[PDB]
Amino acid sequence: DAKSSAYSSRFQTPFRRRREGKTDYYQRKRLVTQHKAKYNTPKYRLVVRFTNKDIICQIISSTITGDVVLAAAYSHELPRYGITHGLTNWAAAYATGLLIARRTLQKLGLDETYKGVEEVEGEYELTEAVEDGPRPFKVFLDIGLQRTTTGARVFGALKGASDGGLYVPHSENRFPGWDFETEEIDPELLRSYIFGGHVSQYMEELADDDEERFSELFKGYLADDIDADSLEDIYTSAHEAIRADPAFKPTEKKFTKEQYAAESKKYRQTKLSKEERAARVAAKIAALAG
Amino acid sequence: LLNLGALHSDPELIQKGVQSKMFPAMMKLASTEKSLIVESVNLADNQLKDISAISTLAQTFPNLKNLCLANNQIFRFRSLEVWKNKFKDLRELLMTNNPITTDKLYRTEMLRLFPKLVVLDNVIVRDEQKLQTVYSLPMKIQQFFFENDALGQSSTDFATNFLNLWDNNREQLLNLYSPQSQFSVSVDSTIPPSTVTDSDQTPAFGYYMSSSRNISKVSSEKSIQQRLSIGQESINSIFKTLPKTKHHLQEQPNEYSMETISYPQINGFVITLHGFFEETGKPELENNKLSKKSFDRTWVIVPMNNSVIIASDLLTVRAYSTGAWKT
Amino acid sequence: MVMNDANQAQITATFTKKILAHLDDPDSNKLAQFVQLFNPNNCRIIFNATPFAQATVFLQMWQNQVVQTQHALTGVDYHAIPGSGTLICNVNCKVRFDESGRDKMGQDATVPIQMNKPRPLWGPYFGISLQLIIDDRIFRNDFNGVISGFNYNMVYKPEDSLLKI
Amino acid sequence: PMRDLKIEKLVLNISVGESGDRLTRASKVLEQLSGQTPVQSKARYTVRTFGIRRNEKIAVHVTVRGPKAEEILERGLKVKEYQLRDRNFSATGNFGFGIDEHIDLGIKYDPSIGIFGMDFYVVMNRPGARVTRRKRCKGTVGNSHKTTKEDTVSWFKQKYDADVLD
């Protein structure tokens, strides 16, 4: 074990989020740093993250003592809107982007003047400003440590937020349907992905193929008795209900603060005093000497 | 056999003034000769303590049977260690007056060097009377056989007739089969050893897999039920499912190997023929076409006064290689 | 008359598996079980195209003159009929070889000039389409003397195999 | 339940002292043996005793994952007659060997190619080794989950029924 005193003296540790591997500080600097003549103006970023089960979307600004959330949305809040199955796919990413966009625009007050792109056809459209009145709320996309490929769900949530009505500056060549051999888009692939057509294509194809993998993988859709030609109506009804009731409601907890605290404290351990530590060392000395 | 000893004492080769790469290329020359047949070798005292120049002889002279290499000058076994499964059918070896033959291992490792040895240096290290029946087959095989000679004659006649009809036009499958005469069809994905002569590497029959009523291939019930054979309509469906192929039996009647028997439960007679089926044309229903591929029909026909009526109609796609008929 | 059900396919798969197990059972005491699983009353059994009459003598000569191998099953047939008790399958079997240079009974090839077995020394495999025509009463486990035809015919044997047919 | 000691990698490599037709030959050999296309490798530095300058190709290698790994491993153990020698086993828990005269591997006796040799090396692991290979939140393996020499020797002694001499 390379544990020299000189090595451990001269060793400089990195930052905490760098040692645990959760922050690229290069991109963090280039993303957070503001023009010094816009004095106290916050740069707002859209943090979109993927766990194994959930999608997180957050509007964050930065202060000296720590970050501040302006609005937030999760993929596990979709069963009050529709979707119960496939909570981390491209269509769910579009839905949670649209949800956080309508929520933030309603919270500011610009929801009735920046309606977004209703009647979505999968094209390319930046949120243009109005001739009179204000200009749209602009956010910058923050994707973190995830690689940029064509067809990724981070750009799915990007298109969801931009069609919700936030001005998020982007190009189109990382959208799934881009042809690198012609440098153009085919928006029918974008339409089918926004309505979840690849999952329906696989459902029909495996239904023609071996049904063992079908009954293993898509067993929730068989238990819910939802035909494969209903996923588009599911996504459309979810978009309508998202644009209808955008406000957030809490989970109505039973695990109150004192109850959850006392139960978790009774389950988990604690430390030991230096008096008992010196007693254990004295017992060690006595058992070693006798 | 050829003798390659004492070439450094022959005036036809001593004055020529040339040995290791010469013998390692003379192995290639003796393999490309192909009309001066030599089985054994005689190269005693070849002025090498190792076996470098005689290393490729095991691959070039794969019909080795004996070797006399006495008064050797070898003092190791690692030069001979590469001879496992190489000239392993040879049955005589002795390289005495040497540190490679006067050691201890000459009786425990020589049998490993030549497992098929019926002799060991003017002796017998194995039961050579029983080795011809234990290390090989006990009896031969029959490329064409039946319960009777006239049964084999009528079976080969109906088999060649059915193969010629399926080559010309199989549109009368509904008229060849009755209401009860059903069918079956399958394909052979996996293949044998790679050193099989002229062997198909993979079954390139990708236009016949959906209607294959094979049990352990697909895992479903309704899929094999739809791919399985009903009467005349689905029989003709299976007949036009695959690629039409003229019978390569009249070229190699030997490799077209047919067994036969009777059926006591219905007073019928069965014949299992197997030959090749090379498909120039294919199925017109919508890597894609066929390759070198074989076929085997296991029919069970019950005769009458008019003709015979089939009961089983089998189709088997396979990987084509040589047949077990030749010697 | 007939139909296309999963019963014949399951019977073909289970018969191929049970046949491979009964042929890989290398001991001599189960050589009666092969004839008892085949039609001990009356059949037609030609294994490797040999004019054999009764399965008992063939299984005895097998246990005295053949060791074990492996059987890679790659295709089956399923043909059935009505009013004839027909069920026909064809196991596409890659059958291996045994490099023990003897029969199954663990001999010593060395002529004695003066325990535990060796490694499972195998050889190159030969392809065959082993056809079994049996009776389809086994949908509720009735397989007592049902195989009317047992035709073992091959397709390709590799030159690397030890025993030469 | 999770600790299993399965096969992670089977790497086949052929190193050639020349830089002639022999590298294309061994490339066709590796593409015929494994089901994937191989990769040729450039020389690091210059030697002039091996006759090697830098930036020119020397060796060919390929990596195999999946069931073809243990298929190739069973063929190599059949060549090695299921015997290792208590070397060829790292402290980290990997093991390999080398095969002269590759004709006994299903490879035929073609003179247009000839005779080569090979090195087989097997990398072993346990489930949950993604923690050292992912990008976000990289970590380590704890000092009870690592594959060690005695664990590999006992597990792949009791399976494949092999023998480890000395």
What does this structure look like?
Chain B has 2 domains: 134 residues, no CATH class; 193 residues, no CATH class. Helices cover 21% and strands 16% of the residues of chain B. Chain B has 9 helices and 12 strands. The relative contact order of chain B is 0.10. In chain C, strands 1, 2, 3, 4, 5, 6 and 7 form a 7-stranded mixed sheet that branches. The longest helix of chain C is centred in the first third of the chain and has 19 residues. Chain D has 166 residues and is α+β, with helices and mostly antiparallel strands. The radius of gyration of chain D is 18 Å and the shape is globular.
Oligomer: part of a larger assembly
Quantity of strands of chain A, as a count:
6
How far is it from the N-terminal to the C-terminal residue of chain B, by CA? 22 Å
What count of domains describes the coordinates of chain B?
2
GO biological process, one term (chain B): tRNA export from nucleus
Domain NTF2 (chain B): 154-317
Protein name (chain B): mRNA export factor MEX67
Main location (chain B): nucleus
How do you describe this structure in short?
Chain A contains twelve helices and six strands. By secondary structure, chain A is of the alpha+beta class. Chain D has 166 residues and is α+β, with helices and mostly antiparallel strands.
Give a topology summary.
This is part of a larger assembly, with chains A (290 residues), B (327 residues), C (165 residues) and D (166 residues).
Chain A: H1 5-10, H2 16-20, H3 25-32, E1 45-50, E2 55-62, E3 67-74, H4 90-108, E4 140-142, H5 153-164, E5 178-179, E6 184-185, H6 187-194, H7 197-208, H8 211-217, H9 219-224, H10 231-244, H11 257-267, H12 274-289
Parallel strand pairs in A: 1-4
Antiparallel strand pairs in A: 1-2, 2-3, 5-6
Chain B: E1 2-3, H1 11-14, H2 22-33, E2 41-42, H3 57-60, E3 67-68, E4 93-94, H4 110-113, H5 128-134, E5 144-145, H6 149-168, H7 173-176, E6 184-187, H8 222-227, H9 232-239, E7 246-247, E8 257-263, E9 268-278, E10 294-303, E11 308-310, E12 314-317
Parallel strand pairs in B: 1-2, 3-4, 5-8, 6-12
Antiparallel strand pairs in B: 7-9, 8-9, 9-10, 10-11
Chain C: H1 6-24, H2 31-37, E1 44-47, H3 55-65, E2 71-73, E3 79-80, E4 87-95, E5 126-134, E6 149-152, E7 154-156
Parallel strand pairs in C: 1-6
Antiparallel strand pairs in C: 2-4, 3-4, 4-5, 5-6, 5-7
Helix pairs in contact in C: 2-3
PDB class: ribosome
Keywords: pre-60S ribosome, ribosome
Entry title: NPC-trapped pre-60S particle
